[PDB]
Amino acid sequence: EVETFAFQAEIAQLMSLIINTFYSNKEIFLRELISNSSDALDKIRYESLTDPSKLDSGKELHINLIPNKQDRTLTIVDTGIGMTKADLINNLGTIAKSGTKAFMEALQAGADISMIGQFGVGFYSAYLVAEKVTVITKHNDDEQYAWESSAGGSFTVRTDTGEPMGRGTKVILHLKEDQTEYLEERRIKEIVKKHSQFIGYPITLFVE
Ligand SMILES: CCOc1ccc(-c2c(C#N)c(N)nc3sc(C(N)=O)c(N)c23)cc1
């Protein structure tokens, strides 16, 4: 059922730095994840241009933002290309190793955490607001998996069942207890307006 993996050392160190470096501009996590989602949607679109059957598992290309005050969760769902088990495990499809170095080198020379996305590792900016991240993904080529990590150097992957998605990725952010501003409709609206207002795909902010 549950496999447990070690992050490579460079990723564990990055994560450790994201969780530990004093940095109040936490709101950028949302832009980085919406922008990962948009990238994932570009990919399935581009692929469906010459094989229209890949849109068989869902034709709308969109992004949903779902807050839940009770679970203390913010979920970013896209119907993008999804990941296979191999992608998930290879740093969620990322070049996280050479990226984390390129990035940590950009810090050294006067970059700040907000540029993380420039090096292909914007994903880990979720750990600015989340104590645990869960990623549920389904790629046409594979079944549905759950990836999960509360940092500490390891992640798990299991196959996921019960709420099939069809195609795409859900990043479920289990928020730190002082970061519940990001469950607020006004707050989420403002951030999207401010950081993602020209995204190629509809974004729908769910109501509670
Ligand atoms: C180390 C962080 O780098 C990441 C981590 C996750 C994503 C990602 C995210 C994110 N975040 C996402 N929502 N979907 C996908 S699909 C995909 C692929 N087909 O390979 C991804 N890589 C991906 C993108 C970059």
Burial pattern 137-146, b for ≥16 Cβ within 10 A else e, equals bbbbebebbb
Specify the residue for token string 């509360």. 150
Q: Is 97 annotated as a binding residue?
A: yes
**Residues 61, 179: contact at Cβ < 8 Å?**
no
- C-alpha 54/C-alpha 169 separation (Å) is 16
**CATH topology classification for 1-208:** Heat Shock Protein 90 (3.30.565)
**36 labeled binding residue:** yes
Residues in the ligand 1 pocket, defined by CB under 6 Å: 33, 36-37, 40, 43, 78, 80-83, 87, 91-94, 96, 120-121, 123-124, 169, 171
Strand runs labelled E in 22-120: 63-68, 73-78
d(CA 60, CA 56) in angstroms, rounded, equals 10
Atom of ligand 1 nearest to the CA of 123: 2
What distance in Å separates the CA atoms of residue 12 and residue 132, rounded to the nearest whole number? 14
Q: How many alpha carbons fall within 13 Å on the CB side of residue 115?
A: 13
Question: Do 41 and 61 touch, CB atoms closer than 8 A?
Answer: yes
Nearest to 77 by CA among 170, 199, 145: 170
| 92 Cα–ligand 1 center, Å | 5
Edge-first strand order for the sheet with 144-149 is 3-6, 154-159, 144-149, 130-138, 168-175, 73-78, 63-68, 203-205
Whether 43 and 169 have beta carbons less than 8 Å apart is answered as no
The SS3 of residue 169 is strand
The Å distance, Cα 177 to ligand 1 centre, comes to 26
Q: Check whether 123 is labelled as a binding-site residue.
A: yes
Name the β-bridge partners of 63.
Answer: 78, 203
In the chain, domain spans: 1-208
Question: Ligand 1 centre from 123 Cα, in Å?
Answer: 7
Antiparallel, parallel or unpaired: β 144-149 and 130-138: antiparallel
What is the experimental resolution, given in Å to one decimal place?
A: 2.1
3-6, long-range: CB < 8 A, 24+ apart: 3/156, 3/157, 3/158, 4/154, 4/155, 4/156, 5/89, 5/154, 5/155, 5/156, 5/157, 6/153, 6/154
The residue written with tokens 């989340």 in the block is 130
Over its C-alpha atoms, the chain yields an Rg (Å, rounded) of: 16
Method in brief: X-ray
